[PDB]
Write a protein that binds this DNA or RNA. Sequence first.
RNA 1: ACUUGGUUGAUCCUGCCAAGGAAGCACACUUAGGUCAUAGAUUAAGCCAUGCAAGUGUUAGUAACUGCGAAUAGCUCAUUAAUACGCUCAGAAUCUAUUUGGCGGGGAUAGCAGCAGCAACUCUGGUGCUAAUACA
RNA 2: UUGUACUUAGGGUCUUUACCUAGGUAGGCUAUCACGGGUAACGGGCGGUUACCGUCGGACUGCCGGAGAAGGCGCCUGAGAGAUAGCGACUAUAUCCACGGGUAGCAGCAGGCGCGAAACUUUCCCACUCGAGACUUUCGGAGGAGGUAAUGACCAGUUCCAUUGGUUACGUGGAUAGGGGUACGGUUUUCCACCGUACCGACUAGCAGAGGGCAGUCUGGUGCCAGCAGCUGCG
Lengths: 162, 105, 42, 140
Amino acid sequence: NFSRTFKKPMRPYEKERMHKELQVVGEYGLKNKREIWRVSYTLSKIRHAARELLTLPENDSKRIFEGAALLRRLTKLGVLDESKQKLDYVLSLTVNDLMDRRLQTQVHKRALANSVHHARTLVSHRHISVENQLVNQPAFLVWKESEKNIKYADTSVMTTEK
Amino acid sequence: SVHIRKYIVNKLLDRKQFVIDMQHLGAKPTRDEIKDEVASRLKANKDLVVIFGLETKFGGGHTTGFGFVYDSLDALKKTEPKHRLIKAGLRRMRKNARRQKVKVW
Amino acid sequence: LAQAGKVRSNTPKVAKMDKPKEVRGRARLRKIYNQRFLAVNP
Amino acid sequence: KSKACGRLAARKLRLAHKSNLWASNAYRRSLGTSIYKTPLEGTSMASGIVVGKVAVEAKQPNSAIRKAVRVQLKKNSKVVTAFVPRDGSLRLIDDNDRVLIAGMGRSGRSVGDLPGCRFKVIKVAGFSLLALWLGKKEKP
RNA sequence: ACUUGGUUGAUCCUGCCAAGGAAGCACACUUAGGUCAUAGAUUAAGCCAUGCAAGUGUUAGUAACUGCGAAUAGCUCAUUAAUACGCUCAGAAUCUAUUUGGCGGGGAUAGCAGCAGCAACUCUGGUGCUAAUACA
RNA sequence: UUGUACUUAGGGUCUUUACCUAGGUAGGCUAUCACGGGUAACGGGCGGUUACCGUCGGACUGCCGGAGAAGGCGCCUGAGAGAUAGCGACUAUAUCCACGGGUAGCAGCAGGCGCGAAACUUUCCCACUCGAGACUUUCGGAGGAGGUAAUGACCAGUUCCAUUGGUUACGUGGAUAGGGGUACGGUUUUCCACCGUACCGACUAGCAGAGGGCAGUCUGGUGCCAGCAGCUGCG
């Protein structure tokens, strides 16, 4: 049916947590403080799954199928290098790693937008595409394979209309 | 640009049936235009083609849709639903007025 | 009981200073970020 | 130690647990029911007709008269005192109107300085006091 | 896998009371756009105007009769503290339209035609005929 | 606990049985909670909360099984009913009457009265999913679609990139939208709204607070009064 994608924080008015969360928003150019908390909650389901796998035996039928399948999905997303592709390194990873894979930031690295904020504007105004396919959505998550294929959609950038 | 894809010869309603996958750049294909392009490809005539339910994607120049082609006029007279025939080119009265035939003998 | 809501009526009621409207959404948070973390900062 | 630990001893543990819940006041309050004989009747919000206007005063050390209306309820036909928040506001309420009452927000008990009453008036005449106090809605 | 304010001149405790996080009903203030889901259960299983919800014709039974359907679907939770529900078995103690496979072996009414009766109804009386994969 | 528990024989049932009627014994259940009372009790798949263990809720739960059609009770037809948009009577509400007599069961879909803190349209539709049937055709308030609602879930905008002067945010410089408008092509049974394509373009933020738990010792009014305040407290 449905699910709760972000969770609210435990204690509202902690100084260290609020002062941390501004300079994740500032660096990655972000709307609210909730658009962090979903990516925290996305990091939870990765790590809660990973830890349970770790508890199991080193030979069990569940670990062999799941462990290979889990690392395959993260090598797509481009968080784990082939140096670090060994299951314990899933229990690492930060929101700073997982934020970096989004479309906003991959435009910026590309530099087409010219700014973190500018990248958001380019995607929100239908300028950017991913292999001949328009992406309005500013949180895509690009799979490294397709990271190369980030380019101008057509409109003002290509069409040149006012 | 007309891709024919996932294609099977259903002989029970004698019709060769498929889905079309046309990609257009710049965003401008007319249904009539589509019949022109498909009929040359399957030596068909325009009347013997039915194309229905075709869907542009989010944003990009793209469109894909169902369609199928049959020998003769004998298929679409009898096998087709009526809502495609009136569209292409071929009211509670019963509930009220009807149940008076029980009320009156 | 004879006197109720006395304080509120008897205030010298003040004209609000009308102001330029704030930039909403991302700009508010961006305007905080560079006011706060860019300078002068710990 | 201080309880039965043995393998077959699950009847002793389960049955002794049922007894010790009746010491806990929250289980006791829920179960007794025990809540029905209440003006609220266990409902967060209730409405009905104002009888009049009353001055009830605070305990100590806080010297202040609070102004709580007497209100008959709709469903029970009981009567109960009910606080009116914000300054003015007793003047806004009018005599013999319908009002919506709700709880003091203390999950029962008596709240601040003010003893006795456990109830505050949320609306009058289908409008709400905050709107009235602020004056972005009207009464005739 | 988290703490903090409140008994004292101050202390360390027991100890609750508050704060704090979630949802689920209801009240409130405020509101560009999109997809999707739900919405008279809580109290009155209280009461209901009007309209409509179960009918059914094939090249092949003859408006009716005849055949099947209407015991499902839909709504609600008032009964019910285990007899219901669930989960294991069991019929060697049973019934079963329809499908499916085996084995078998002439006369009398309905519409139609006519004469009447009620303030009223999707009630009918009485006579004059004729149907069958109905009835014998 | 008195058909209450066994036994032998019968009746009855689709069959088995105290299901019921006979004769013969006097048994059964109970501190491993019988029996009785209460439930703001339909049961289950499950839902909310959580580190684990648990714990609360389960009308609905997009399903499963049970029960009920205003309240009991009885019965015909049928493979199947103790049917209720079938019949029968009584009772309680309601209504008609030409005063003789009758008529009706929305806990089906809309809609209203009442109840209350509390819950939508008296629209369009058989095309989808399927169901009934003599059946590719008929019919379906099952079902499907719009319409109203901050109830719930996800997504998401309120701008951007330059550089002049005041201490890097407080007349310029240009850009780029969708909100919206108008066509046409898709879309669906039909609208709406969506998804495209082209042309018009220099109105979009509150709510809650600022002793401590958990951002001012600003200026003005008030003077244990008005008032705030979950708690401690403030005046």
